[PDB]
Amino acid sequence: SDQICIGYHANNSTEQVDTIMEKNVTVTHAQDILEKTHNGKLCDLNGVKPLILKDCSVAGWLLGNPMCDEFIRVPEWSYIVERANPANDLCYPGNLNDYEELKHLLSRINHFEKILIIPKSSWTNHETSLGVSAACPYQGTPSFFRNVVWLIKKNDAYPTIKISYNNTNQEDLLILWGVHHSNNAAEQTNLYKNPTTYISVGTSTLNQRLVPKIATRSQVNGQRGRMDFFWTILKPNDAIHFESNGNFIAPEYAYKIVKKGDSTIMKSEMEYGHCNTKCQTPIGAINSSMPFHNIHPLTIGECPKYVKSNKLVLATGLRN
Amino acid sequence: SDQICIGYHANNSTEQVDTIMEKNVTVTHAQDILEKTHNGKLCDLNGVKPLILKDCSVAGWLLGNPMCDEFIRVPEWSYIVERANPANDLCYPGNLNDYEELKHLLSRINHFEKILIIPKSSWTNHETSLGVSAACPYQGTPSFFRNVVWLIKKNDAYPTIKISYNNTNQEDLLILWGVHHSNNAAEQTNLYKNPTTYISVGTSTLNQRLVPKIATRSQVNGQRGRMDFFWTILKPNDAIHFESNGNFIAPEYAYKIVKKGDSTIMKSEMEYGHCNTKCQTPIGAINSSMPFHNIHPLTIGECPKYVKSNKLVLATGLRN
Amino acid sequence: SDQICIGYHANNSTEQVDTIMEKNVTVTHAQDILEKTHNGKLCDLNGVKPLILKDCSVAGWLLGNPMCDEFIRVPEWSYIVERANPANDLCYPGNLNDYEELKHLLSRINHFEKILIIPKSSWTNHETSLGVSAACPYQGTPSFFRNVVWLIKKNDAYPTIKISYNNTNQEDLLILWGVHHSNNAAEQTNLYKNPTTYISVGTSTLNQRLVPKIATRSQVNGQRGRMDFFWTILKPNDAIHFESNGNFIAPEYAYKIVKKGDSTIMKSEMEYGHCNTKCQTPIGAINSSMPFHNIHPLTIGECPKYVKSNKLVLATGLRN
Amino acid sequence: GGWQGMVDGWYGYHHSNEQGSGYAADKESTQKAIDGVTNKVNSIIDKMNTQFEAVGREFNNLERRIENLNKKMEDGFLDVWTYNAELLVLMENERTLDFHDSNVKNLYDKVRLQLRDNAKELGNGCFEFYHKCDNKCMESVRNGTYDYPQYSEEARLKREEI
Amino acid sequence: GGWQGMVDGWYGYHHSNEQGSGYAADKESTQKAIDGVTNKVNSIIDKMNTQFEAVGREFNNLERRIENLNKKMEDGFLDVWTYNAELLVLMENERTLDFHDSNVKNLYDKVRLQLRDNAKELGNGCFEFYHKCDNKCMESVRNGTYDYPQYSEEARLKREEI
Amino acid sequence: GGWQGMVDGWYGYHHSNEQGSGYAADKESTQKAIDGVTNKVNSIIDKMNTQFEAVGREFNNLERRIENLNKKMEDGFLDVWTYNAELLVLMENERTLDFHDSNVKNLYDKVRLQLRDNAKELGNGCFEFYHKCDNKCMESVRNGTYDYPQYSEEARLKREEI
Numbered sequence A, B, C: 001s002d003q004i005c006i007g008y009h010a011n012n013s014t015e016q017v018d019t020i021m022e023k024n025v026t027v028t029h030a031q032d033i034l035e036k037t038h039n040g041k042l043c044d045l046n047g048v049k050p051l052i053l054k055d056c057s058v059a060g061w062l063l064g065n066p067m068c069d070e071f072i073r074v075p076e077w078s079y080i081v082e083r084a085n086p087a088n089d090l091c092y093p094g095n096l097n098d099y100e101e102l103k104h105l106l107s108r109i110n111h112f113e114k115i116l117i118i119p120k121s122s123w124t125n126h127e128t129s130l131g132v133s134a135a136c137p138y139q140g141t142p143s144f145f146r147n148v149v150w151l152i153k154k155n156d157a158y159p160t161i162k163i164s165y166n167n168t169n170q171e172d173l174l175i176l177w178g179v180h181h182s183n184n185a186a187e188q189t190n191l192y193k194n195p196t197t198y199i200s201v202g203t204s205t206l207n208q209r210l211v212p213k214i215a216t217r218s219q220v221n222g223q224r225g226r227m228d229f230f231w232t233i234l235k236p237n238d239a240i241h242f243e244s245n246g247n248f249i250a251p252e253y254a255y256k257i258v259k260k261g262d263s264t265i266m267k268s269e270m271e272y273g274h275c276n277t278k279c280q281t282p283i284g285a286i287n288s289s290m291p292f293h294n295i296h297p298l299t300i301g302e303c304p305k306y307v308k309s310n311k312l313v314l315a316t317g318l319r320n
Numbered sequence D, E, F: 001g002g003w004q005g006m007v008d009g010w011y012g013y014h015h016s017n018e019q020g021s022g023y024a025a026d027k028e029s030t031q032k033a034i035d036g037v038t039n040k041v042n043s044i045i046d047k048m049n050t051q052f053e054a055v056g057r058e059f060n061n062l063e064r065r066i067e068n069l070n071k072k073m074e075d076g077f078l079d080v081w082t083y084n085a086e087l088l089v090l091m092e093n094e095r096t097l098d099f100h101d102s103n104v105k106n107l108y109d110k111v112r113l114q115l116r117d118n119a120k121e122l123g124n125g126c127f128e129f130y131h132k133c134d135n136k137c138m139e140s141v142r143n144g145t146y147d148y149p150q151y152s153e154e155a156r157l158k159r160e161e162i
């Protein structure tokens, strides 16, 4: 006797899926909406390459620690990659003021150009070749940060410096300078003659005065002295006014800077991978349309939403 | 032969609705739960009016920049509205310390009243009528912040000031004063006689010392000098103790203040609209019970949840 | 005439439940997923006891305010509990620098041990027994913070102190010291002889210089003077170098500290309950597997998600 | 398809007999759906907890890290609310439409039950009677009181004819 | 309506014949519902990710902007979790009740299919037999083995009697 | 159970007659389910708003309070998105499976309606014809054109025969 039956598809899929009332339900077809993979590499972000600092910190790179002696132009970048512990940082120990906000400012940069603003030869009444230290070697011989100048007394004098630099460029300028904290009265006269010293710095917004702290400290990189560095953004028609009678670490170079956009500092040990992406993680780039991912929380770019899951599997087919 | 049928409503609605499995489904009735509209105006918030500053910054208003004289009282307010770029701010250039925390403190105020605390006439041994500047004009003529006094040497002397003010009111007092950074030794003796000066300020909590920074700076509003202003909340039975031998910008007026709640500063170019609301945005007030809105993120009040959508349409009726 | 019916369970449950389309639906069985209860007590967190400070602030406890004489010697703790307003804080008025970050650092501590680092009897050329004040009474008699020493001139001299302490322990050391702001020139010579004084403090990272602010201030706890305290973490092989010719409040004791994890400061008026929990609130511990709770927002531990509800009731049975 | 002619409700009947035809809305089940759909919308609205917040831009040019923290927070909640609101609307729309479906198919069923073999399921939502069903007969199927015995035999004998 | 009598399960049968009446729960489909509803509750509970956090008020009187930032974050999450939790409970309650419905109507259907015209759908969940259904006949409909031929004719002739 | 043999679709027919048996898929309702399930997935994907963010660790060792604030925000959103994603998948899976069910039971009903008493509902998804249904008859029930008139009599006779 003739029969017609109504039924549904089946196959040898083992794909399993959970439901709010049932677990481990085998189905015919399924789709995972969790992105689990990455390409293992550091990539450009929307067409622009990161600034990969390698064994230098942002500070060492900026100030020109002579172990970072590699000053190549990258004139723009989309993020900065630093190692967890760069080996080259402040070779001569001390500080960089507002360092984190500076790194944040520099995280993404549309135009960056190193320019000479105050040539070494312009210091006629001070020594410009004796401010070097075993703490900052270059080719094993004592040296110093290459973008600033540690002025020393000449003959037996340090006349009071009064200079100004006008930003005649069309771009903001990032300028840096510093103060040297000497160790005692003898060292102070030995280097600068004048025992009681100061540095004054003025722009249209800046109004700074630095005074050395002549005191006993522990040794770092062989030195008990310290150098405290400071910075400012000198706007296109403004000028910066320096005055000092000692302990002044002067600008030499400075940087034309155009901003446009923000990012952050990525900590990764990886090297450039000659790739492009919309979503970078410190262990590799993500290339996905999926709405969720479980790769890494410290992402830069436009990424899926980070979650704690192994598996987000939607049923598409039937019970099997 | 007779027939009965079962069926359902239909109409000439074109309303469309999406479903998780179907798009562009025409339905009979529908309801949008996204608030898209606002009244285009700046309103009171729960019955209390904002402080609308117009062409002044909070600093210019507080210090009494003479282009802001206009001192009508609002004795209380629910939020402050400042223009993106108020024209009148620190006429004599410089700073106001902790400015952003001050603005946040003043964002919402339950009682606010200007009172005289140290009358001009009380300065018998200093000049009180020569501290005016072309940087702070009133109708083309040199003037100065109206709530503080720029004291000058008298005869050829500036004896050391030692004064105190006890807060005998029942309310906290917001008090402001400043230090003048002169440009060089000649100007310093010209204005204050004494070359090496200071200001000391003490209360039950405050323990401050200010020292002028006599240095070269760029011109702003015609001036190379600067004035750095500072503030404190003097509690009802406390006293404030000032001491200075120069460069002191002294309180004259001060403000009774009662705090209660918190708010923030709204940036808007709009003017008051003689309306009331529970939810203000910088482009207009929202009056809604809807759970979501897409008007503006910078809301003050009790608002729906902000989202990125054009349209949140629930089906209420049938397919059509 | 014979009949079979199909039906379902019913009972005399009054449990009610809402649905998205219906309210107040009586059901057979129901389950509330909102945790509403707590044990009313302060407990250990994952096996480790809190530091319960009672009538002392962290500052008063750390510096050894003599009304904090209750040093039961907890060598580790998981969180700190303070009362809303500890009565015993800086008995001699002033400040503790970076107080909030310090508290955050000390919120959870794996090992904590008070050790003597500079014995009182080591100060041969300064008075060590005269630095006491009615502001810091013990048993009604004048005293002082027990972990630091208020050095005074001896004979009629205060020779310049130059000392250093090397951390020969295997653990970081939390060290504290302070500067005394005297009230006028007479008091200054009376206590320290030298009129113009300073304190310098140096480690491998620290480079500090403190100068007293000799000025008029209001009375607090009977005193117009102030003491500003400062701290540092001295790493295992580093040394700290102190130099002063006056106004120096010197370390005596310090603390071996091992860190490991982070927590925060809990404000509670309650009492230790000899209990353990995963989730502490300031009104009691929570012991639950429920996904939500409405007890209190200021939780420490792993808690359910805090919500504003009375009731989250899932139907398990049928309509009744 | 659905019916333009039915104006007094959401679900109902078209009856075609001797006295003329016409539409009648099922009052009770229409009201059920209105109450339910109304409760749904209100629940979606009323369950939202609203609180006072003041949102501005209070951080300066040397507090950009904290400003970034606020940005991530703001953008974060915007992402959460957008996705939830959009999906909630999608899901509840699916359900609302399925709810209407189910209500209509319950009407059809409760009629099919009463009629049994006294009528012929045309398979387009309509029932073709094997007997003569006046306006009171029609009204009776509508309020669930139609009496099957009354008509069995007239239907029993109109059947085996064709 | 539901049955105060039936105590050994969630869904079942009341049988009314000569030997006396009584209730019998359907074991299998009752267990299916208990498992499913139990899984639902556990899923709602077990899927919550919980992590250690320490929540306090660590900012001072000149850090009110940051404190505000923390407030907006805390309140933000409270609003997210409140809405989600409340709506989740509302939606899953709707479904749980519909699930019971669907289970009962599947029982009714599988009986309706066995009986066919040997019984009369009373329309209140009950079937009125056109024949004599003893306690073994009753048991047979319950375990899906009721045999339609056995009774057709005793029914076919009590049916054409009305 | 489901059918290994049906290879060309999701829902369909197995026909068992004289010329041999075989499976055929119902095109229309299979396509409706593929469209719907495809929409569901794309909706769950496409409704996610994605925005640029830069997530790092920019706070120093004396900014641990702010760092903690960021931690609570990050973990917060992770807890929100984890729960919502996990539950969403659980709930939509339930619905997708119920959707398939409902589609199959609607196929079954549209056949049941063409056949009426010319066949016997076996109650396992199959229809047992009371007449002889060749491969063209079979094809006719499949494309909805089965002609009930042709076969009424032959079925009437074979039905009354039992």
Ligand SMILES: *[C@@H]1O[C@H](CO[C@@H]2O[C@@H](C)[C@@H](O)[C@@H](O)[C@@H]2O)[C@@H](O[C@@H]2O[C@H](CO)[C@@H](O)[C@H](O)[C@H]2NC(C)=O)[C@H](O)[C@H]1NC(C)=O
Residues within 6 Å of the ligand: A166, A167, A168, A237, A238, A239, B218, B219
């Ligand atoms: C910074 O310099 C500009 C430009 O100054 C002129 O060009 C320079 C290369 C140099 O040779 C100067 O001597 C020139 O004066 C200043 O802007 C000018 O200011 C002058 C002086 O009052 C004014 O009359 C002009 O209008 C401006 N000229 C141009 C070309 O813009 C500027 O103010 C200097 N800034 C500071 C803060 O000192």
Ligand SMILES: *[C@@H]1O[C@H](CO[C@@H]2O[C@@H](C)[C@@H](O)[C@@H](O)[C@@H]2O)[C@@H](O[C@@H]2O[C@H](CO)[C@@H](O)[C@H](O)[C@H]2NC(C)=O)[C@H](O)[C@H]1NC(C)=O
Residues within 6 Å of the ligand: B166, B167, B168, B237, B238, B239, C218, C219
């Ligand atoms: C600040 O002022 C108050 C009030 O001063 C009194 O009232 C004035 C109007 C005037 O007549 C004064 O001479 C009075 O002294 C001081 O409070 C009084 O002083 C102490 C408390 O510290 C105590 O002897 C009194 O009971 C207080 N009386 C009242 C009515 O409050 C207060 O001490 C002064 N504060 C400082 C820091 O000096």
Ligand SMILES: *[C@@H]1O[C@H](CO[C@@H]2O[C@@H](C)[C@@H](O)[C@@H](O)[C@@H]2O)[C@@H](O[C@@H]2O[C@H](CO)[C@@H](O)[C@H](O)[C@H]2NC(C)=O)[C@H](O)[C@H]1NC(C)=O
Residues within 6 Å of the ligand: A218, A219, C166, C167, C168, C237, C238, C239
């Ligand atoms: C801090 O002291 C350590 C410990 O060194 C020694 O033991 C002390 C108790 C004391 O007796 C010292 O004189 C001893 O030298 C110093 O550690 C030494 O490091 C230096 C190298 O810089 C070297 O002379 C020693 O061999 C080291 N010994 C050990 C055990 O490490 C350390 O340098 C001192 N640091 C400072 C900043 O003073």
Ligand SMILES: *[C@@H]1O[C@H](CO[C@@H]2O[C@@H](C)[C@@H](O)[C@@H](O)[C@@H]2O)[C@@H](O)[C@H](O)[C@H]1NC(C)=O
Residues within 6 Å of the ligand: A014, A016, A023, A024
């Ligand atoms: C559910 O399934 C989990 C993973 O399943 C694994 O792969 C499938 C294809 C099977 O071969 C299964 O046996 C494998 O282990 C299990 O590990 C898990 O324990 C299961 N959970 C329950 C509640 O049954």
Ligand SMILES: *[C@@H]1O[C@H](CO[C@@H]2O[C@@H](C)[C@@H](O)[C@@H](O)[C@@H]2O)[C@@H](O)[C@H](O)[C@H]1NC(C)=O
Residues within 6 Å of the ligand: B014, B015, B016, B023, B024
């Ligand atoms: C869905 O429809 C969108 C535009 O629809 C328009 O608005 C409504 C009010 C109707 O009246 C209709 O006539 C209009 O065309 C499109 O943007 C979109 O592409 C459509 N969806 C699909 C799947 O094509």
Ligand SMILES: *[C@@H]1O[C@H](CO[C@@H]2O[C@@H](C)[C@@H](O)[C@@H](O)[C@@H]2O)[C@@H](O)[C@H](O)[C@H]1NC(C)=O
Residues within 6 Å of the ligand: C016, C023, C024
């Ligand atoms: C629903 O019920 C609300 C309060 O419920 C009360 O407590 C339960 C346990 C019962 O005893 C109930 O009868 C009580 O009223 C009412 O206050 C509320 O108005 C009701 N709302 C609606 C829409 O029915």
Ligand SMILES: *[C@@H]1O[C@H](CO)[C@@H](O)[C@H](O)[C@H]1NC(C)=O
Residues within 6 Å of the ligand: A287, A288
């Ligand atoms: C990501 O994946 C696709 C498909 O696998 C691949 O071809 C390409 O590398 C990526 N595409 C885009 C649009 O980023």
Ligand SMILES: *[C@@H]1O[C@H](CO)[C@@H](O)[C@H](O)[C@H]1NC(C)=O
Residues within 6 Å of the ligand: B276, B277, B278, B287, B288
């Ligand atoms: C908001 O709109 C409602 C509803 O139309 C209106 O009646 C009410 O007065 C308005 N509320 C305010 C505060 O303007």
Ligand SMILES: *[C@@H]1O[C@H](CO)[C@@H](O)[C@H](O)[C@H]1NC(C)=O
Residues within 6 Å of the ligand: C276, C277, C287
């Ligand atoms: C929590 O409650 C259980 C049982 O309700 C009780 O025995 C004990 O007090 C608590 N258990 C744990 C593990 O803290």
